[PDB]
C-alpha cells in the first residue's frame, strides 16, 4: 500500500521559566521511529524503532543537530509571534509544525506538505505544488515575505521531492519485517438491548496494521450511515490498532443489517451477522 514520512513538532512557551517545552516525533506511516524531548536528559534524537537503531553516529549527530535547530527556531518564533499579535508575556502559547512526504504503492513520490500553526490554528502552509505559500492572516502574510525572500519553499521542495522520499524508501526497506506487514483485523460482533425492543450491535476490528480501515453497517444492503455510531481508530498500545462501529436496531429486524469490513490485510472484505 501507500506510505508516508512525517515530522511533527510542538513548542509550548512557559511564561515564567525560560525555555519552551519542545517535542519532536518522526513517523513512517503509523509507526513512530524517532523522538526528541527537551525535558529528557540525553538532549539527543533517540530511536523508537529497532530498524533505525542500526544507523551510525553520523546519522544521530545530524539528526540531533537539525532537531536542535528546529527547537531554536520555534523558540524565537514564540517571541516573534507574541509581538505580531501583541500578546502579553504572561500567557502560554503553542507553535506546531508538520511536514513530510507520501509515496504510492510503487514508492513513487505522490505529494509533499509543510504547515505551521500558532495556538492550534493554521498560520501558514506550503501549497500543493510546493512553490507558493498560503498565509492565514496578516501576521502570516509578513512571514510569507520573509520566507519568499529566503527561498524556504525552494529548500523544502528539494527536501520533500528527493531527500524525504529517498530516506523513506531506506526506512521502508531496513524495517520491512514491520513497516511492510499487513495484519488483518481479528473481527467479531457483540449484541446488547437497552430495554427489550431496540438493540445495539457493535462490530469490532482488532489487532490490525496498517491503521487505515473501513467499518460500516448497511441496511438491506443499502448504505445506512446516519443511525450509526463510530469511534476514532485508537492504538492498541503495541503497534496495532482498534476500531468499532455500532448501530441501534429494533429487536427482530437485525438480519437486514450487516457489518461491512475492508482492509489491506484481508484477502476479501468481511461480512458479519448475529
Amino acid at each position: 500500500g501507500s506510505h508516508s514520512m512525517r515530522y511533527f513538532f510542538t513548542s509550548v512557551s512557559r511564561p515564567g521559566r525560560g525555555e519552551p517545552r519542545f517535542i519532536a516525533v518522526g513517523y513512517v506511516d503509523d509507526t513512530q521511529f524517532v523522538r526528541f524531548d527537551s525535558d529528557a536528559a540525553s538532549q539527543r534524537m533517540e530511536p523508537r524503532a529497532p530498524w533505525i537503531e542500526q544507523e551510525g553516529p553520523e546519522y544521530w549527530d545530524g539528526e540531533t543537530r537539525k532537531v536542535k535547530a528546529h527547537s531554536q527556531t520555534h523558540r524565537v518564533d514564540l517571541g516573534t509571534l507574541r509581538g505580531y499579535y501583541n500578546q502579553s508575556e504572561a500567557g502560554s502559547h503553542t507553535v506546531q509544525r508538520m511536514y513530510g512526504c507520501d509515496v504510492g504503492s510503487d514508492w513513487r513520490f505522490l505529494r509533499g506538505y509543510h504547515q505551521y500553526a500558532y495556538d492550534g490554528k493554521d498560520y501558514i502552509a506550503l501549497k500543493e505544488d510546493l512553490r507558493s505559500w498560503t498565509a492565514a492572516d496578516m501576521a502570516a502574510q509578513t512571514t510569507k515575505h520573509k520566507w519568499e525572500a529566503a527561498h524556504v519553499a525552494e529548500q523544502l521542495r528539494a527536501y520533500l521531492e528527493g531527500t524525504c522520499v529517498e530516506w523513506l524508501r531506506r526506512y521502508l526497506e531496513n524495517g520491512k519485517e514491520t513497516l511492510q506487514r499487513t495484519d488483518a483485523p481479528k473481527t467479531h460482533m457483540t449484541h446488547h438491548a437497552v430495554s427489550d425492543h431496540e438493540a445495539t450491535l457493535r462490530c469490532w476490528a482488532l489487532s490490525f496494521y496498517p491503521a487505515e480501515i473501513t467499518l460500516t453497517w448497511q441496511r438491506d444492503g443499502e448504505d445506512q450511515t446516519q443511525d450509526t455510531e463510530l469511534v476514532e481508530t485508537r492504538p492498541a498500545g503495541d503497534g496495532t490498532f482498534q476500531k468499532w462501529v455500532a448501530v441501534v436496531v429494533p429487536s427482530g429486524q437485525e438480519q437486514r443489517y450487516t457489518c461491512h469490513v475492508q482492509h489491506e490485510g484481508l484477502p476479501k472484505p468481511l461480512t458479519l451477522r448475529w
Partner: peptide, 10 residues
Amino acid sequence: LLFNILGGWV
C-alpha cells in the same frame, strides 16, 4: 531524515 532548517524564522 529531518529537513536541514536554516534561518527559517517566521
